[PDB]
Every structure is written in C-alpha cells, then in structure tokens.
Amino acid sequence: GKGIKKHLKRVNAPSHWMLNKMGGQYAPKTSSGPHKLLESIPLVILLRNRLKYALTFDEVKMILIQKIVKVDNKVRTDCTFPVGLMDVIHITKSNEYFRLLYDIKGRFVPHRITNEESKYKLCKVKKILLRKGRLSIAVTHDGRSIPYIHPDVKVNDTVRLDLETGKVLEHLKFQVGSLVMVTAGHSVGRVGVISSIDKNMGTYDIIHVKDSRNKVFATRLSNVFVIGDNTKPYISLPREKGIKLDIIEERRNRLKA
Amino acid sequence: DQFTIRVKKYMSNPLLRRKQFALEILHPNKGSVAKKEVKERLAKMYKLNNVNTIVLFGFKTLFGGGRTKGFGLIYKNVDAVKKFEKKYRLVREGLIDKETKAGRRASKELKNRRKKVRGTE
C-alpha cells in the first residue's frame, strides 16, 4: 500500500507538548488546518493537559459536543484541531479569553487576555499574489487569504486584523528599529528590537536582535515575527516579557524560598 | 468517628457541571475510615443536602498507616451525574444496575452471518 500515515507514536511527538513517556504508545496526531503540526498544539492538549478541565479524551469530546468553545470567533468541534501562535480562545460557559504565546522556554501557554483585547490578532505576511483583473492577495502565517491589500504592505511585515469582520485595521513594518518576537531554535520566546539585517544573496538572511538588558542574539529571517513599532508592543505579554536569564542567575532568583 | 479531611487543589468546572478536587484523610492509630462516612462529612462540610451527587475514587493508605489519599467529585444534581459519568462508576454508586454479559462471542455471530444472504440473515 504505502500511503499517508495516520498514527503518531508518543516518543516521536514534538518535545514541547511535554507528554508522559509512560501510559500509552500514541499521541493525538493533530488534524490538517491553518497551522503546521510542529508549530501548533491540538485542542485536546490545550483542554486536558494545560487547563486541566478534562480528565480523559472522552471528556474533551463531551465538552466539545456542546458548542461552547470558539477559536478565532468560530465554534470548533474537532478534537484534534490545530490552534497555533496568535489565536484567541473563548469559552462561553466560563466567560474566559486567552491568547497563546511562547514563554521564555519553547512551550505554549494560554495568556488570559481581557474582553476588549479579544477582538483582534496579529498576522504576518508570507507572500503576496497577483491574480486576474489585477487584484492583490496576501497570505498570512495563519493560512489565510486577504484580498484588496494595501499597496504598501510587503512580504515580511505584520498586520492587525479585526475578528468580527476580516478587514485590516493597520499594518506594522519590518525595519531596523521594530520590536520582534523570535519563534524557533535556541531562542523561542525572546523579545528584543533589531540591530542589523544581512541579506546573503543565494542563502539565508541573518538578523541580530538586542534585549532590553543589552544582550544580543541572532537567528534566521524566517523565524522572526514583528509585534510592535519602535516604542511599545501591540499585545499584552506574559510575565517575563520575553527576558531570558542564564542558569546561574535563574537559580539565584529561584532560591527565594 | 475521629478523622480530619483536607481538601486540596479545589477547582470549579462550569464546562462540566461539577467540582473536582484532591483529598487527604488523617486517621492516626486507626485504619481506613469507610467511603460511606467520608461522603457524610463532605455533605456537611459543603452543605450538600443530598449525598448521591458525590463520587470518590482512587484511595490509597500510605505505608506506615494513619493517612489516606484519594480523589473526589461533586455534581450539580443527579441528572448531571447520569449524563456524563461512565457506566462502571455509575454501577458502583448503585444509580443503575445492568449486567448484560453476552460476552465476546458476538464475533462468532458476526462471522457466521456475512456468509448468509440478504433475506434470511
């Protein structure tokens, strides 16, 4: 036969899900949708392992049968739906609102935003297409098509999107002084600004970022997400504000009882 | 008779219709206050008029003796118990009593039924 695989084994699941190596040979195996498997979590993980509202898988099912969970203002009943980075989650029965973010480690957390902040999100552009009749469509990291994009929006910058109507509110550029969150290896939740851009011709582009403690790190261009202009961020942040300390200082701080 | 209950990591779950919590029971120099007594104390502790909305499971007695750990579960009413509790728990509580035990010999019936044709099988 040799077709598409349908099962996922536990020790082969992405490590940032933090699954018990005992109790089971399998993992939920997220469905196909707006996010990649390795850059997302299935809804069962969020709703049982993190929030602890459910005890088993079937309890997640009984929760989702009654239409009380919404992602991006739409109800979802799929137990393996992918959730992903900047999405908002609303639970009517508890009247709660969350936004997923990376912490200073490489793992996802629900951030518990307020009701007013629950009406938008930030999307970063991946490419811009020109189609019949000369209209321009932007494709976001969210796997989303936005027609009639403003002519000044380019490939790597981010945009702010209303959720009741799929319209654009404003857009944020990708420059030397913009504020950034990094989303891949060796620095997955750090927030810094930007120092320089390299532009190697045939290969990857490297950019450098400076912390608010004057610490500097670098990464690839493809795992850089703009979250604000020079001064302030446009969303609330988790408690560390993306400041990563080394292990000696972290151990010293933790030793306060 | 003489025991103390300490309820830990208490949490309310409006998505389901229950409260869920951990438990620890201190009974020095005696052994294993019964599950029936714990329900009655919890009903008083939580003003639970009735008693048939409480579910307890996973009790261990902690080598050495004198203390026990477990889990507990308190429901909004009886209808919420039957809606979303499994059948095996619902039998231990006595709410239902069904033991249809036809066995795994339905595989025999399944196999010798597909070889017969539309009308008779």
Added chain:
Amino acid sequence: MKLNISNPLNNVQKSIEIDDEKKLLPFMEKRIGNAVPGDSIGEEFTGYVFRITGGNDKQGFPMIQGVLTNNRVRLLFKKGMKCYRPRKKGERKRKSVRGCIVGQDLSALNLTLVKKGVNEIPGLTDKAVGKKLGPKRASKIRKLFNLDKSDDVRKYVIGRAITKNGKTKFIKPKIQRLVTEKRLLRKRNLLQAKEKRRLEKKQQLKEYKQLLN
C-alpha cells in the same frame, strides 16, 4: 427437462415435469430468444407459441446469451455482466458458464408465453395479478390518473387492502418531488444570498479603488 412457463401479461407462471426425448425434439438446437411452437408438449397446447429465455445444465451452471457453443466454457466476469456479483469494487473473477444452444444436457428451460391456442390451460391464461406496488414520484401518479395541474396529487395514492391499525386508515407511502413552500423558500433564499454577495463585492471593489490614491 423441468419447464417453467411464465405469462408476462398476467403475472403468473406454471411448471410441468417431462421425462421424454420425443416431446422435446422441436426445442433442440435453438438459440435463446427465438420462438418455438408448443404442440408436442401437450394436446391442449395446440396453437401456443413460446420464447426461450434461459436455463441451466445437469450440474447447475446457467446459460448466457453471447457464447455460441453447446457446452461449458470458462470466462472472466465484470460488473456489467450477467451471472456474477462482485465482492469488492473493480474485482473480476473467472467462472465456468454454459452456452446458449439448447441440448439434452439441460435441467431447466425458463421459457415464456406469446400466443394462446384453442384451449385455455387453466392457471396460465385465466388469472391475472397486479403491480404489487404503486408509484411514488408525483408526475408518475398524475400521468397514471391522467390529471391536470389543478388536481392535487396527495388524494390519489392508494393502499390496496390497508386497514392495518385503525378501522380503515390506508397508510400511504411518502411521495417525492412534491411542490412545497420549503422548495419555494429555498429558491427565494438562494436569490437573496446571490444578491447580497453581489452588493458586498461591489462595496469592496469601490473601497479598494478609492484606497489606490
């Protein structure tokens, strides 16, 4: 050797048993689908004409129309063919089947009636049986009862002997393709949705053309 005669007009059939070489002589070496007189099978069959429709041999293998031999052959069958039903989709199987020429090696005939003779052969030309099930598509009902548009169709569906639960109720089949307000609601809703999409597209186009400044 065993004959099954069926009357298609009156929906009735009758079988007779024959152990004789003399009586079956006219039938031999005839293909299936061609007429043959029935005088020799009985003096009361004088003036009767039959047609051959099938049969099967001593071992029980059926006959098929295409093959022009007098004995058994071995073919591989597909979905559209006659003496085969697949277990999977796209499955094809090789089976053994009998030719379409009549011979002594048969065990059944399966022939039908065309013409009456001089007698009446009771049980084959006297009785008649109905459809056993009435139509369900509405246009079929109105074409059956030769109605016009104004005539409501719901009042002419018939159960034959139905008095099942009440004293006399005649529970009737549900009929499809009836004109209901629902249908109408579907049409008006679809038209409204189309117009709304048109208006929204015009709005968006005008707005974007404004923004290009």
Added chain:
RNA sequence: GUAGAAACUGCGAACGGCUCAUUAAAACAGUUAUAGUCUACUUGACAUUUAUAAGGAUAACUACGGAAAAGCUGUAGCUAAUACUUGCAUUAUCCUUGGAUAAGUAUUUGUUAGAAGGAAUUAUAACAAAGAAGUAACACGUAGUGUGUAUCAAUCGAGUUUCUGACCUAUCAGCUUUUGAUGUUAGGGUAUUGGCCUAACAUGGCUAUGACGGGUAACGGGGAAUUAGAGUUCGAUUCCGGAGAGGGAGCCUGAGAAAUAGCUACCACAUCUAAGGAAGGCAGCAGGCGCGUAAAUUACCCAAUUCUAAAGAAGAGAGGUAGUGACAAGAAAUA
C-alpha cells in the same frame, strides 16, 4: 410525529501489526533543488458561452427453479434516492441617457507588451483560433447548519535530485560498447526532468587515490560492551528509513496500491468430491509438527492510549490486564 430486519448509496479497508531473505556507492545519515511535478479528508478566499420543479431502470420483495458441494445463481412482475441523467433563467466593465455587449474556469497553438526573485520564456495585459468541467430540480429546524461543486492558496504527504561519508580480498588488472555503453539533434511516453524508449549521427565513459569481479554466519542509523588517554568489538530486536508476504511475472478500483485475510496465470505444496467439479496461503494473535544447545496461555476487556465511520453511544488479538517466567535490575529475614 417516534422506532426500525433486508437492501441501494457514502466513507474507510494504501493506516496499524510482523520479519530481516535480498541489498556493498545500492539502502541509509547529515546537507541541498524542484525556475522539472502529483496531492483525498481538513482550513481560507469565491464563479464563466415545465421552473409552483423534467426523465427511465434497478436492488430489496412476490411467484416458478437448478446443483453432492461454494460468501453459486436463472426467468417473469413491481418500486425509490445526495445512485444514473436532462435542463429553467441572471447581470458586469470602457466611452448624468445610450453605445459597445463581456458573450468562456482550467488547458493547447500562433503574434506581442511586461508587483516579485540572485536569475523569468514569472504574476499579469492585448490580438487570432479551439475548449474540458462547473456556478444547488438536495436534506435538517436551526439570520443557522449538513451534503456537493470550477480555480487559487494553506495543511497532512510522496516521486525524483546536489555534495560528502562503509567491512575482508590483487592466488580478482584492465573494464563498458554488435542487442544503449558516453554524448548531440528531432520525436514518443510520464504527473514532471532524464537513453526512460525510438531514428539518424560522433567515438566516447571508468580505472593502482584499486575500476571490473569474489566473500560476508552484512538490512542502514539513533545506539551497546569494555576501556586513564588512544582504541578494539557488537547493533535480528521499543524510535526513524528500506524491503517482503511460498517463488516469479501481470492487472482492476481508487486522491493514494504494481495491495496479497484484492484479482489473473505458471512452478512447488496441499483440501472436499456423488469423479462432472469447487476451494487455498499464520514472516497478525493464541496454538501444533519439524529443527535443533537454544524460547510462555488455543485466557479477560475495550476502563485507559489512539484510529476508522452516516463520528458521545459502534468496532478494534492495534492496545491494556492478568497467567508462565533464578534473562537482566533494585531493596532485604534466617534473631
């Protein structure tokens, strides 16, 4: 209005589980390309040349049957559909009415113009010829959903592909090319590139830095044992990749197979028979024979981990639980 044996229709059965026979620049590992391609379910955008509602025909079923036997089926009479088919009504753009009409989504051929990538025969636009397939004759009672549908984008994947990296043997020194070996031109074929294949043409391609052969009680890797530091030896076997279903070769359906609890034939082995014929594949789970120095129960359950479906509610020897068990590992009586 509620329930519903049979049956048609839809989706899955290409995932899972097992084993290590083949295999020495092959497979595999780290690094690349697809500007040379295909892609079901799921997610987002969103459409073009009788209508108060069209057609005929078939299961299940009834009656008459055949055969020792099989998941065998003949003739006659009925009847549905989101099965199989036909087809209605509608505006948009350029110059505060009219005119030209646009009359065609993908795809193919000819002539041109030209926001992005390092690089375009690129998005895209015009002119002249062809042109698939579609835009609801469907169901629920929640403005809301379910099912279906042209093209683009995303997602779950695959096919090819760049560079570098293996054990012993020279009592294996020259090899390949008539019959594709190495290149060029034009075609055919494929989802695409390619001697992948055909025709014409040229004489090339590899090699002591070990070609071409022989051997392996050789599947590769993540890893394991022992070691002060160097090293030497192992890796059938929890995860990833590859290959196979007694041995070979063909094929249908399908988004996906050269599938084997799918089909066709030969070789070997083997089952029932009224002697005409019919039906096979434990390297899946238990279990038996044989082989040998060498290895366990013809048990219970879907409660947990997950998967499939018309997706709370069914099923799963996947999986879990016990039974056997001085392989290996830890604690620890005989005062």
